[PDB]
Amino acid sequence: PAASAAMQEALEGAGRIIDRLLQEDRADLSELLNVPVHTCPTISGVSEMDYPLLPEISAIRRVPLPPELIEQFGHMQCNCMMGVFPEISRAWLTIDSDIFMWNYEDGGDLAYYDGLSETILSVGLVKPKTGIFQPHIRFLLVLSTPVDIVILGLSFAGMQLLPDPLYSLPTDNTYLLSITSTDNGRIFLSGKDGCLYEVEYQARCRKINHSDPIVQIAIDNSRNILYTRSEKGVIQVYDLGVDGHGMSRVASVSQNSLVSAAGNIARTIDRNVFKPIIHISVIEMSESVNCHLLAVTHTGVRFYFSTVPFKQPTARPCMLALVHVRLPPGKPSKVHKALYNNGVLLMAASENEDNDMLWCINRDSFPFQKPMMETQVTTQVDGHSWALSAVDEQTDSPVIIQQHMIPPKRFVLLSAQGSHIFYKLRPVDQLRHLLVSNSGGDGEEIERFFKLHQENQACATCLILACSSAASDREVSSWAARAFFRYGGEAQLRVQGTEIVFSGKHNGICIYFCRIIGNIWDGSVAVENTFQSGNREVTAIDSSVTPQHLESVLKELKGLLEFLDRYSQFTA
Amino acid sequence: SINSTFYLLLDLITFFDEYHAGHIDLSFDVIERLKLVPLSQDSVEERVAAFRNFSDEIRHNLSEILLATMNILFTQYKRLKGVLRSQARALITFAGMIPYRMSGDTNARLVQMEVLM
Amino acid sequence: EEKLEVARIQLQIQETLTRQYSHHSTVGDAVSQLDSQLMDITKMFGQYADPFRLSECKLAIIHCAGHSDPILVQTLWQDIIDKELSDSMGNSSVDRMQS
């Protein structure tokens, strides 16, 4: 009883800390960038604290462009273009009339296609519109030549491209500059005369015009808002309606209107640093319901732009109003290509004509800092950056709570010399290298990382390795727990009523546990599912939890029991 | 301990299987993750101290292990020709500090290939 | 072989100084010297550690050479002990035990 009652009291206080932390864990890019209202832009990127700053990127593994391509490069005298297709681990290199597509992972699967007589000018990949093609046709390759648009089916056994195009249509003597698509398989093309066109197909295909050559079409299939940009920095916003089959222009802003508003906001900057506008990019709602556009300037001015009034999540796009301007570190110059993903911004700059510098900034270091901080670094890369893509893998809490299950993240950069993969190391791999260099669980750098991450979270990230089981860490392990024992501090009674501050260890293990499972601390044990068994609806009560995830959760819990046990005697 | 040894054994079995197949990059990734052989100078000392606790069946293989690793990285500078340097350096330094007489012809191939780059 | 043995014992003295003796004035100079050239046994014995009471490195060398006069070993051990104990004076009794 008194035992069981104290146990209930425990589980309760535990869940109390757990809900406290999870609530904090839901806690926006808006409330990050300190922009109070949809109309009240602010700026960051000027004070050293914003960049108050331990390897952050993995060391680059190179990979040479497969020899066959360095061979064929002798025959391209008209033109050449190279793009990266992430979803299929592929690169596409068009010589004037022909396409070559290779396995960008290791240079295999060189497939060629020479069925075009005139110069291919733009290329697109499309996931086919549901049920329109038979099931072997995984994707559609759209090619754009000075005369026409050609649609070829692409099946996958091995890269299998159908030799006969699935469709042909006239480009109307209008050079197609960019090919793009939204999730449901709508095909958009950018006409060199700045007109946005749509290729509406069914099971049968037609071009249509819905609308300063527009050179980049960004589609956020998370809100069905199509954002487009002209060479003169014209930014046009079109709503596709809630159902996403619509097309209607809703807003537009000119590069000069931008620069003017800018010089109005940041009174001290030479206004030219605002222009021209090199990149637009959709900031998916998943990270921020508020912001719906990021913009990247040649001098790295980073602009945030919104389309609907703040805290109006159902509104399709209505305006194009800037909210906050991000000034760069220091300094970046000649930015000539870029890519953004999940609080990571990479930009390729022309130091020399054949050597590029890659700058990357990210907000990992202090996901809990008001205002936003970020760590950044630049690295050498051989070649003019022809394309810079990310590999798509399979609000969120921040890494500092989910590191106990999810990988450190991989990014891939493509250059004239080849591929360079790198990894954003979670705080885990940080603590790792900090340990492995000093080669022993003691080191002042350890005192530093400890003071940095607010001892409690430290102790947690310490256990994060202190129970790892694969072989490569057996030694590190014995060290790190030593560390957890040394730098976590000591329990003491804080006399204010007297409040107890459990040592970074206690709350740390608590947080570790909750981070292990957490959501089931309050969630349902069972949920009624309904299956349409023919002409009869069947109610079953199925587990709220699935097996495989439960197996993993167990395994980790077992681990926690193990460490808890091995330390059980040592705490008394 | 045992469980570890077992898992590592299956793993390295896969590793050498791939190696014999020649999907080199795979093997590279495998060893890389396996964090046994140092591959960048600063790791060396740490990895080396580990040997003074590594269980036997590993030790029995460590020779062919290092051999294949350096053969791979060699082929890497080969294709890049036809970091790698600093990695090779970490490997050779490991070989030196290692409190265990590797075989002779082992040391022979190691030194020769370390030169030929 | 005996050489690389020495070299280790040195590097141990070096990292030990760095970790423990950032506040010491003469730290940087000992550092530069020892990072310059291979030191003789008696050198490392008298100049670096004997000044700094680096009992760990002391036992390290004393084994590296093999003199063994009973009382010295015991005093050295007890020294390592009482030190490691005193340092944990702030940790919990249990933590002191585990350390």
Sign of CA dihedral A542, A548, A553, A554: positive
Of B34, B46, B80, the CB nearest to A471: B34
CA-wise closest residue to A472 among B39, B18, C99: B39
The answer, for A429 touching chain B at a CB cutoff of 8 Å, is: no
Burial track B29-55 (b if 16+ CB lie within 10 A, e otherwise) = ebbbebbbbbbeeebbbbbbebbeebe
CA distance A87 to A391: 7
Q: Tell me whether residues A570 and C90 touch, CB distance under 8 A.
A: no
Residues 52-71 of B with CB under 8 A from A: 53
Neighbours of B11 (CB within 10 A): 17
Partnered with residue A335 across adjacent β-strands are A349
DSSP class of residue A402 equals H
Neighbours of A517 (CB within 10 A): 16
Of A106, A470, A475, Cβ closest to residue B25: A106
Six-digit token string for A79: 């033109």
Residue pointed to by tokens 């050597």 = A355
Backbone phi, psi, residue A189, to 5°: -135, 145
Start-to-end C-alpha separation, chain B: 39
Element (H, E) at A197: strand A196-201
Give alpha helix (H) positions in A41-123: 67-72
Q: At what angle do helices B56-81 and B2-21 cross, to 10 degrees?
A: 30
Sheet of strand A159-170, all strands in order from the earlier edge strand to the far edge: A122-126, A137-144, A148-156, A159-170
Do residue C90 and residue A490 have CB atoms under 8 angstroms apart? Answer: yes
Q: Where are the alpha helices (DSSP H) in A272-405?
A: 399-402
- For residue B7, the chain A residues in CB contact (below 8 A) are 470-471
Tell me whether A558 touches chain B (CB under 8 Å): no
Q: Which residue in A483, A364, A382, A391 sits closest to A84, CA to CA?
A: A391
What letter would DSSP give residue C9? H
Give me the amino acid identity at C97. M
**Amino acid letter for position A342:** N
- In degrees, rounded to 5, the angle at the alpha carbon of residue A168 between the alpha carbons of residues A165 and A169 is 160
Token reading at A258? 């931008």
Cα A3 vs. chain centroid, distance in angstroms? 48
Amino acid at A223: R
Q: Which of B54, B57, B86, B67 lies closest to B19 in space, CA to CA?
A: B67
CA distance A100 to A114: 9
| Interface residue of C17, C98, C99 to substitute, partner A, most A CBs within 10 Å | C98
Neighbours of chain C (3+ CB pairs under 8 A): A
Interchain contact, C95 vs A485, CB within 8 Å: yes
Please judge whether B53 and A470 are an interchain contact, meaning their C-beta atoms are less than 8 angstroms apart.
no
Closest CA to A326 of A52, A57, A41: A41
Distance (Å) from the C-alpha of residue A365 to the closest C-alpha of chain B?
24
Torsion sign across C-alpha atoms A432, A437, A440, A442: negative
**Backbone φ and ψ of A332, nearest 5°:** -70, 145
Cβ-Cβ contacts under 8 Å between A and C: the total is 24
Helices (H) and strands (E) in chain A, counts: 11, 31
Distances in whole angstroms, Cα of residue A474 to Cα of each of A439, A445, A462, B35, C11: 13, 22, 14, 10, 24
Rounded to whole angstroms, the Cα distance separating A338 from A294 reads 12
Tally the residues of chain C. 99
Amino acid at A159: M
Q: How many CB atoms lie within 10 A of CB A458?
A: 25
Specify the residue for token string 């033109």: A79
A226's tokens: 């199509």
- Rounded CA gap, A99 and A445, in Å? 52
What is the distance, to the nearest Å, from the Cα of residue C23 to the centroid of all Cα atoms in its chain?
Answer: 17
By C-alpha distance, the chain B residue nearest A433 is: B43
Instruction: Determine contact: A55 vs chain B, CB below 8 A.
Output: no
Q: d(Cα A290, Cα A35) in Å, to the nearest integer?
A: 10
Cβ separation of A471 and B80 shorter than 8 Å? Answer: no
Task: Please answer yes or no on whether B28 and A439 come within 8 Å at the CB atom.
Answer: no
Residues of A in contact with C92 (CB under 8 A): 490-491, 571
* Residue numbers in B near A443 (CB within 8 A): none
CB contact under 8 A, A570 and C91: no
CB-nearest partner of A436 from B4, B7, B43:
B43
Residue A436's H or E segment, with its range, is: helix A427-438
Residues C76, C81: Cα–Cα separation, whole Å: 9
Query: Which amino acid, one-letter code, is at A466?
Result: A
Q: What is the resolution in angstroms?
A: 4.2
Residue C92 is nearest to which of A438, A443, A491, comparing CB atoms?
A491
The per-residue DSSP string of chain B comes to -HHHHHHHHHHHHHHHHHHHHT-HHHHHHHHHHHT-S--SGGGHHHHHHHHTT--HHHHHHHHHHHHHHHHHHHHHHHHHH--HHHHHHHHHHHHHH-SS---HHHHHHHHHHHHH-
- What is d(CA A189, CA A166) in angstroms, rounded to the nearest whole number? 18
The dihedral through the CA atoms of A312, A216, A228, A187 has a sign that is negative
Contact A189, A205 (CB under 8 A): no
The closest of A299, A365, A350 to A327, measured between CA atoms, is A299
CA nearest neighbour of A175 among A190, A192, A188, A189: A192
Q: Is A59's CB within 8 Å of B43's CB?
A: no
Helix (H) or strand (E) holding A379: strand A375-382
Name every chain C residue with its beta carbon within 8 A of the beta carbon of A486: 99
Residues sharing a CB contact under 8 Å with residue A352, sequence separation 6 or more, in sequence order:
none
If you count residue pairs, one on A and one on B, with CB atoms under 8 Å apart, how many are there?
Answer: 41
Residues 6+ apart with CB under 8 A from B50: A474, A475, B36
CA distances (Å), origin C43, targets A77, A187, C28, C37, C48:
71, 78, 17, 12, 8
Q: How far apart are CA B106 and CA B69, in angstroms?
A: 13
Give yes or no for a contact between B88 and B75, defined as CB atoms under 8 angstroms apart: no
H or E stretch including A258?
helix A255-265
| Host H or E run for residue A447 | helix A444-452
Residue in chain A nearest C21 by alpha carbon? A444
Rounded CA separation B48/A307 (Å): 58
Yes or no, beta carbons of B34 and A472 under 8 Å apart: yes
The gap from C-alpha A166 to its chain's centroid, in whole angstroms, comes to 33
SS3 C29: helix
Mutate to test the interface with A, among B25, B34, B35 (most CBs of A within 10 A): B35
Q: Please report the sign of the dihedral spanned by the C-alpha atoms of residue A259, residue A260, residue A261, residue A267.
A: positive
| Amino acid in position B45 | E
